[PDB]
């Protein structure tokens, strides 16, 4: 699988995709969740329809889907406590989130 991934000429799909296809007895479109690798053509196809992460631009998001999207993004340490707090406060103020109890 690693060798196939390194050679960017094929798409690597998790077995869950085939299991779901069998469950619904139909061809389900690809999603970033099922794709372990993306060929340049598939990468270009997903770039327009889908965000760089496992999130989409057209189809809405649900609780589970947002949880998976947040799982894909890994924690980063480019922020600072003070600036992070300022950004959080600005975000709450902009969208009127001052009614929260916490």
């Amino acid at each position: 699988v690693k060798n196939i991934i390194l050679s960017n000429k094929h798409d690597v799909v998790k077995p869950a995709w085939l299991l779901e296809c069998f469950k619904t007895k139909s061809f389900v479109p690809w999603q970033p969740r099922f794709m372990i690798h993306m060929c340049p053509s598939t990468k270009e196809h997903f770039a327009r329809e889908y965000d760089c992460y496992g999130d989409s631009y057209f189809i809405d998001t649900d609780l589970n889907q947002l949880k998976e999207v947040f799982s894909g993004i890994k924690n980063s340490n480019e922020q600072t406590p003070e600036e992070m707090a300022s950004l959080i406060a600005d975000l709450e103020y902009r969208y009127s989130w001052d009614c929260s109890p916490l």
Binding site: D51, C52, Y53, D55, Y57, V69, F70, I73, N75, S76, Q79, M84, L87, I88, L91
Partner: protein, 32 residues
């Protein structure tokens, strides 16, 4: 609790910035 809140907010704001860049890129094509 503070760590969890900070992590969730950072993830959400990053996703929102990605959406905003997509919005700006799509709007840039209106003038064309």
């Amino acid at each position: 609790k503070e760590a969890l809140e900070t992590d969730l907010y950072k993830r959400f704001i990053l996703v929102l910035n990605e959406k905003k860049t997509k919005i700006r890129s799509l709007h840039n094509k209106l003038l064309n």
